[PDB]
Amino acid sequence: RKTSSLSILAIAGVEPYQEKPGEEYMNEAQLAHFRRILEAWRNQLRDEVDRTVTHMQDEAANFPDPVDRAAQEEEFSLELRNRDRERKLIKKIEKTLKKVEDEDFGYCESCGVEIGIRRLEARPTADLCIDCKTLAEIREKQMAG
């Protein structure tokens, strides 16, 4: 959804959180907010995966013209790859929803630091503060290659 604020908040019927003066970070009202966002996002992804699978099955049923056989296969692979990515995202959201249920949502998993509210509104599935997240990515390239 073409919105300045991630189509994610759009995906959910959510409006950017109006943080009050002295509110503690992840209080009941705040996590209820992010729980809703995560759930809405997850449900949307699930519907996309279903539509994809259905399209893929329609493709398996309808035979293309010799000319469009390479084009169908190309698009089919894209659907497949994409589909599998969404399933991963959905599992991540589910994991995040348990952090909410467990009241352990909103902080960096490496260092105890709180992850931004606006940052969580961008990727509510965030596991690391930007620093630890980045450092991890760097270690990756080095411990790997």
Comparing every residue's Cβ against Zn ion, the nearest one is 132
Report the DSSP beta bridge partners of residue 114: 107
Contact residue for Zn ion among 53, 60, 80, 111 (CB under 5 A): 111
Between 32 and 130, CB nearer to Zn ion: 130
Contact residue for Zn ion among 10, 11, 122, 132 (CB under 5 A): 132
Q: Is 119 in the site for Zn ion (CB under 5 A)?
A: no
Mark out the alpha helices in the chain (DSSP H runs). Answer: 7-11, 28-61, 69-101, 117-122, 130-144
In Å, what is the CA distance from 116 to each residue of 27, 31, 88, 94, 106? 14, 13, 23, 20, 8
Q: Is 110 in the site for Zn ion (CB under 5 A)?
A: yes
Residues making contact with Zn ion (CB under 5 A) = 108, 110-111, 113, 129, 132
